[PDB]
Swiss-Prot record:
Keyword Glycoprotein in annotation: no
Family: Belongs to the bacterial ribosomal protein bL33 family.
Source organism per UniProt: Pseudomonas aeruginosa (strain ATCC 15692 / DSM 22644 / CIP 104116 / JCM 14847 / LMG 12228 / 1C / PRS 101 / PAO1)
Gene behind this protein: rpmG
One GO term describing the cellular component: cytosolic large ribosomal subunit
UniProt-recorded name of the protein: Large ribosomal subunit protein bL33
Oligomeric and partner information: Part of the 50S ribosomal subunit. Cross-links to the P and E site tRNAs.
RNA sequence: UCCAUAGGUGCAAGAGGCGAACCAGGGGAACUGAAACAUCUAAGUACCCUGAGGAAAAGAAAUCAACCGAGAUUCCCUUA
RNA sequence: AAUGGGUCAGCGACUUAUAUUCAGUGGCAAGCUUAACCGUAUAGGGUAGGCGUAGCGAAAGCGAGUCUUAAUAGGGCGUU
RNA sequence: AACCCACUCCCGUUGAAAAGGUAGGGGAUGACUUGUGGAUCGGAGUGAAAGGCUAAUCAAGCUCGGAGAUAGCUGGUUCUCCUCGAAAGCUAUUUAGGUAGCGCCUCAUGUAUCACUCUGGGGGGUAGAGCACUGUUUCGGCUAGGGGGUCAUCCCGACUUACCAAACCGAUGCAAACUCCGAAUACCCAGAAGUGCCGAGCAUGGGAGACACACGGCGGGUGCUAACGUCCGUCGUGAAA
RNA sequence: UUAAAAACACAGCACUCUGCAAACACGAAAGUGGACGUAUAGGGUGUGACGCCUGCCCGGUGCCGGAAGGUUAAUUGAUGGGGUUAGCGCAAGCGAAGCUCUUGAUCGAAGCCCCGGUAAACGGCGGCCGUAACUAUAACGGUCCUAAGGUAGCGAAAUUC
RNA sequence: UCGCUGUGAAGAUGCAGUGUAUCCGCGGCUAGACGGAAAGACCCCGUGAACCUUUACUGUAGCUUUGCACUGGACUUUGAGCCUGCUUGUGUAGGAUAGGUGGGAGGCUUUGAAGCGUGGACGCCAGUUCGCGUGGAGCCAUCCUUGAAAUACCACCCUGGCAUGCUUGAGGUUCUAACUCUGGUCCGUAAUCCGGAUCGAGGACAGUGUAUGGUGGGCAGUUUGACUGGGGCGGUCUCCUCCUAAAGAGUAACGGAGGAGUACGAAGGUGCGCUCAGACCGGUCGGAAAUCGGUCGCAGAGUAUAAAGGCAAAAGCGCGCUUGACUGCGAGACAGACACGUCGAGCAGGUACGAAAGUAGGUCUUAGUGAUCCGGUGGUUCUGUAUGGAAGGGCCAUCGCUCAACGGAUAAAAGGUACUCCGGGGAUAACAGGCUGAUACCGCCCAAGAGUUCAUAUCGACGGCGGUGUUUGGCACCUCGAUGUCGGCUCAUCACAUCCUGGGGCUGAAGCCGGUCCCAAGGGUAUGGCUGUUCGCCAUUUAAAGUGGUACGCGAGCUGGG
RNA sequence: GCUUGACGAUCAUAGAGCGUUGGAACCACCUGAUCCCUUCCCGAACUCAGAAGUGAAACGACGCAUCGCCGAUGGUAGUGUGGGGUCUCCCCAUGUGAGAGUAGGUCAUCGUCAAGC
């Protein structure tokens, strides 16, 4: 079943998004551009551990 | 058991028992509430026991405050 | 053909204390009111305290504003 | 026999008696019966064991205290007149005979809306109807084809379809979970006349009760279109006339 | 004080515990019974004169013995990570010694896991296929499972619908 | 203070209609007053109670393990630490030997006694250390070659292992002086208690305090859901779709049918482009069904996942680019007890596609879910108990429940009661009454057929229509502050759907006997064996051994076998 | 008013099917694939440069009711209110009133703009 993950900003802020994924099917990480509220720009977010 | 100790007799002085409550201690429930019930509550209450007094207890900061200060203990009204 | 009462006389069930809210009726009025306690004792004193005159925010705080927010934009609450 | 016991019948049952009597019955030198004095007791004693007995009380004695334990459960609640007037529903609940918010009653304050009819706008998929879809029914015609055989062809060509037959054409029925169609009524909305007991609507506060409903008509499920059956919707009456 | 019996006891039988300050029981304890007894004794448990007998299963749950290994308490405190501040630094920030907050290496018995016994310990003791000179039935063969598949006796029974 | 028949909270002295009847005792009998007595004991309910059980939960007495204390000496085995000489340092490599660093570049202390080696050895073994066997004797040649740095030389630490030292974990043995003795003899003393003394035995064990693991129904406080055509057993309990549902919304049943407790980094956004299923004809192995060509067809396909409502600007299909599955909000609504829920134009920041107008705050829509408390993680213009910090708290983001009994009592919980008890209920079962009549029983309609032929003498298949309250049931209206339930005895009373006796028609009625139907209720209508039996089966009778109602008549009339 | 193109209004009385007809202009077919651009292959489609040919295909216009689609009048079914019966179903008074079918209609009717008369 899908497991929760965190998406941490590449900037120095501590902002993060949250979602889930299928680890068995797609085993690589996710690199997706999102808006960072603290710096008010679109930056790249990287997968991390929910726990 | 040598010493002297336990022990044994004689004198004096005191205590012992009773009392409704109050006071300082020792021991210490459950029903009940939680709309069930174990933590919790009821409650350190009921009850039992021991001492004292006309009262008792506590009392003269190894205390509080907050950089300004207060000045032993007890009781009342607020802070609440 | 469900309950209660053989009858009479007497007795027998919404109380009291303390904290409060609303209404009626009064005293003062941007102020109102004292508690313990003194007392010439139902008087008078005692205004420590309580409520009101300003709100918003979790708070620091700022204030007819304030909070949220990058935002004197929008919106919540408040102000004649 | 005495003495200890208690198997049977009857009487008695407001008794002579809160366990007896008459007539029969068992043991009767023993694990016997009995007097006096003594010991063990309340989660404790004693018991050749029946949960028996512990002062006519025992699956935990009596007495006084905690104590007016607690009781969503029964019962009861005392003088008079006037105005108004319910509910037995929805939601949640270790909830279902309790309670809480909302709906329904009453009182106060404020404020401007309401009801009935006429006219004008609006959506619908019910009753009915139908077969255009999805299922289901019958008749006839027309047929691919399976094949009923077929001269029996070593086994392949066929003579024909004497059985069955998709599909198509026409006729003809049915449907809560079918629809090419489709009302009445009921619901929203607006504009108007009058009536309203002088108000109807709405908002905010004080006080509730109630959340076991019953039958009758109409529309339904369930049942046997059985029940003074039962479970909904909508009216009327009883409740409370 | 509605049940006198098939219920309880019983003599006999068996298992098990106990070496004496006994096991065991009543007692916060002192002590007392057991017992002024001593394994031919004392306690508990079941069965219930006598006769003939008392079959199979140690997988479960108890009890008994074993000690190699695994897991394992309080206790102890290696290691790592923080807080404070003499100092250094323009600053940001680094920071010795003390004190202090967490972390948790190592040490550690019984028990449990393991190995083996024990049923007059608590308990348990099966199915399906073929097969005989008529039929029928299977002495006989396969096969599944189990710790093992009920023996001797008795049986429409105080048990049988 | 009458009977009957109806009615009626459904079994009436009291109501309706009607019939009977002067007023009042005494002796008797018990059919009724749902007669008296005991707030039903059966049954259900109460977030009632007792007592009992156990591998329910949570604990506990007792028993047992180990640490510390009371609690000491010696010897020995042994792990760890520590001190000293540290002599040990044998690799590719070098005559020979590598852990390195500074003084140091040759050693001249009996030279550095010399070639092998003697006594002892170790040795990645043939190398090195220790008196040259004689004795006061020229060997290591200092990069002499090689080796990553040549020894000689003063110092800085350890390494394979030894000796001792002061400590230290465990093990065994012993000693006596702590402790213990429910062992002897002396004294207090006139004493099987108790002390003190002294002998004997055990002995740092036992035992007790405190801390800790195990065991522990021996004992204790409790828990063990609700709905429900009575309870129990079974089933269900949250969410989505359709019907019921009566053409706005909503609407119940243990009513009729199905699904959910997910999926997807593309299955999302955008630009561009394109249409299906199926049928027929033609065409290599396939042949009804592969891929190819053509015509028809238009949605009979598809849509991640049930069903319903939708789908041409396709919401279906493919390709390029991509992250709007964005952050702060939010006019206004829909739903609604609350807590929750649903839709959304527009504004501000930053984006993505597209030439651009523009589109994008996930997916065609409606299921895919769980409050608060508590604890964890990342930030932070907050707070931080004298002060500066810090701990802890607040705010923002996020994680942990099949709390499925799904608004979730607690972090933590099963049973028995026939030994039972209290408060209640005809709000709710068992007996009898009531309503109903599926079923039961009794009639009738049709007539295939059986009856040698012949439908109806006697029967009668497949089907149909009634009657009675009479069986098994359905319901739950009366009674739980009590209406005694099977069978037997005693005593009855009524109906007729007649068993005998009486009167008739038909007959497949010769007679004697019968069969069937019609009329008729006056009177009659067995005894026994077995069983608690009513029934039933047997034996022997009789003219015959009727069927039913009456609280399945009758316990204030008896019994007590069930 | 006449013909052809673009965009609309309206969504079958406007559609389908059959027959006839249109190249002056427009439109369509057409030639080639150098150049922009394109095919998961192909200039088939998209695109570019015009122009020799034709109205065949397509499209438009005009005819026909064969199919489709519209469709009365009258009657019938249902139904709100009030009242009756023999009451599982109906009837009466009053208001309302389908679906199906029958007679019959239909080969559409309009607006803006630009090219030729
Ligand atoms: Mg003396
Ligand atoms: Mg005194
Ligand atoms: Mg006194
Ligand atoms: Mg005290
Ligand atoms: Mg005291
Ligand atoms: Mg105390
Ligand atoms: Mg309690
Ligand atoms: Mg309670
Ligand atoms: Mg309570
Ligand atoms: Mg309770
Ligand atoms: Mg509790
Ligand atoms: Mg507990
Ligand atoms: Mg307490
Ligand atoms: Mg006290
Ligand atoms: Mg005194
Ligand atoms: Mg004094
Ligand atoms: Mg005194
Ligand atoms: Mg005095
Ligand atoms: Mg004084
Ligand atoms: Mg004093
Ligand atoms: Mg003093
Ligand atoms: Mg000072
Ligand atoms: Mg002083
Ligand atoms: Mg009466
Ligand atoms: Mg009664
Ligand atoms: Mg009465
Ligand atoms: Mg009652
Ligand atoms: Mg009475
Ligand atoms: Mg009085
Ligand atoms: Mg007032
Ligand atoms: Mg005033
Ligand atoms: Mg504002
Ligand atoms: Mg405002
Ligand atoms: Mg006796
Ligand atoms: Mg006699
Ligand atoms: Mg006698
Ligand atoms: Mg005797
Ligand atoms: Mg004798
Ligand atoms: Mg004797
Ligand atoms: Mg005897
Ligand atoms: Mg005697
Ligand atoms: Mg005595
Ligand atoms: Mg006594
Ligand atoms: Mg007791
Ligand atoms: Mg006892
Ligand atoms: Mg007993
Ligand atoms: Mg007893
Ligand atoms: Mg018993
Ligand atoms: Mg007494
Ligand atoms: Mg007694
Ligand atoms: Mg008790
Ligand atoms: Mg109390
Ligand atoms: Mg009381
Ligand atoms: Mg009660
Ligand atoms: Mg209740
Ligand atoms: Mg009552
Ligand atoms: Mg009462
Ligand atoms: Mg009125
Ligand atoms: Mg209720
Ligand atoms: Mg009630
Ligand atoms: Mg309520
Ligand atoms: Mg219909
Ligand atoms: Mg029809
Ligand atoms: Mg059809
Ligand atoms: Mg329909
Ligand atoms: Mg309607
Ligand atoms: Mg008036
Ligand atoms: Mg009100
Ligand atoms: Mg209700
Ligand atoms: Mg009521
Ligand atoms: Mg109702
Ligand atoms: Mg009801
Ligand atoms: Mg009703
Ligand atoms: Mg009805
Ligand atoms: Mg009904
Ligand atoms: Mg009915
Ligand atoms: Mg009813
Ligand atoms: Mg009704
Ligand atoms: Mg009414
Ligand atoms: Mg009336
Ligand atoms: Mg009336
Ligand atoms: Mg009422
Ligand atoms: Mg009336
Ligand atoms: Mg009324
Ligand atoms: Mg007896
Ligand atoms: Mg006897
Ligand atoms: Mg007896
Ligand atoms: Mg007995
Ligand atoms: Mg003993
Ligand atoms: Mg023995
Ligand atoms: Mg014994
Ligand atoms: Mg026995
Ligand atoms: Mg026996
Ligand atoms: Mg016996
Ligand atoms: Mg026996
Ligand atoms: Mg075993
Ligand atoms: Mg074994
Ligand atoms: Mg062992
Ligand atoms: Mg610091
Ligand atoms: Mg620092
Ligand atoms: Mg430090
Ligand atoms: Mg260890
Ligand atoms: Mg061990
Ligand atoms: Mg054995
Ligand atoms: Mg046995
Ligand atoms: Mg045998
Ligand atoms: Mg037998
Ligand atoms: Mg048996
Ligand atoms: Mg009568
Ligand atoms: Mg009557
Ligand atoms: Mg009468
Ligand atoms: Mg009367
Ligand atoms: Mg009358
Ligand atoms: Mg009357
Ligand atoms: Mg008389
Ligand atoms: Mg009599
Ligand atoms: Mg009588
Ligand atoms: Mg009676
Ligand atoms: Mg009675
Ligand atoms: Mg009572
Ligand atoms: Mg009762
Ligand atoms: Mg409960
Ligand atoms: Mg309850
Ligand atoms: Mg118990
Ligand atoms: Mg337990
Ligand atoms: Mg313990
Ligand atoms: Mg210890
Ligand atoms: Mg002893
Ligand atoms: Mg020891
Ligand atoms: Mg020990
Ligand atoms: Mg201990
Ligand atoms: Mg127990
Ligand atoms: Mg117990
Ligand atoms: Mg217990
Ligand atoms: Mg309790
Ligand atoms: Mg309980
Ligand atoms: Mg519970
Ligand atoms: Mg229940
Ligand atoms: Mg049931
Ligand atoms: Mg019901
Ligand atoms: Mg029922
Ligand atoms: Mg029901
Ligand atoms: Mg019922
Ligand atoms: Mg509706
Ligand atoms: Mg409706
Ligand atoms: Mg609805
Ligand atoms: Mg309802
Ligand atoms: Mg999609
Ligand atoms: Mg669909
Ligand atoms: Mg794409
Ligand atoms: Mg995205
Ligand atoms: Mg938007
Ligand atoms: Mg934007
Ligand atoms: Mg762009
Ligand atoms: Mg909690
Ligand atoms: Mg501080
Ligand atoms: Mg912090
Ligand atoms: Mg629940
Ligand atoms: Mg719930
Ligand atoms: Mg719910
Ligand atoms: Mg809900
Ligand atoms: Mg609770
Ligand atoms: Mg219980
Ligand atoms: Mg009772
Ligand atoms: Mg009661
Ligand atoms: Mg009832
Ligand atoms: Mg009920
Ligand atoms: Mg019955
Ligand atoms: Mg009866
Ligand atoms: Mg009955
Ligand atoms: Mg009945
Ligand atoms: Mg009944
Ligand atoms: Mg015949
Ligand atoms: Mg005949
Ligand atoms: Mg009857
Ligand atoms: Mg009946
Ligand atoms: Mg009933
Ligand atoms: Mg009921
Ligand atoms: Mg009912
Ligand atoms: Mg009755
Ligand atoms: Mg009853
Ligand atoms: Mg009564
Ligand atoms: Mg009669
Ligand atoms: Mg007759
Ligand atoms: Mg007869
Ligand atoms: Mg005859
Ligand atoms: Mg007959
Ligand atoms: Mg007769
Ligand atoms: Mg007769
Ligand atoms: Mg007669
Ligand atoms: Mg007669
Ligand atoms: Mg006569
Ligand atoms: Mg007889
Ligand atoms: Mg018999
Ligand atoms: Mg005869
Ligand atoms: Mg009779
Ligand atoms: Mg009877
Ligand atoms: Mg009878
Ligand atoms: Mg009797
Ligand atoms: Mg009887
Ligand atoms: Mg009697
Ligand atoms: Mg009677
Ligand atoms: Mg009677
Ligand atoms: Mg009698
Ligand atoms: Mg009996
Ligand atoms: Mg018409
Ligand atoms: Mg009507
Ligand atoms: Mg009409
Ligand atoms: Mg028409
Ligand atoms: Mg039509």
């Amino acid at each position: 079943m899908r497991e929760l993950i965190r998406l941490v900003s590449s900037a120095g802020t501590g902002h993060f998004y949250t979602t889930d994924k299928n680890k068995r099917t797609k085993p690589e990480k996710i690199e997706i551009k999102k808006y960072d509220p603290v710096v008010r720009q679109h930056v790249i977010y990287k997968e991390a551990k929910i726990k």
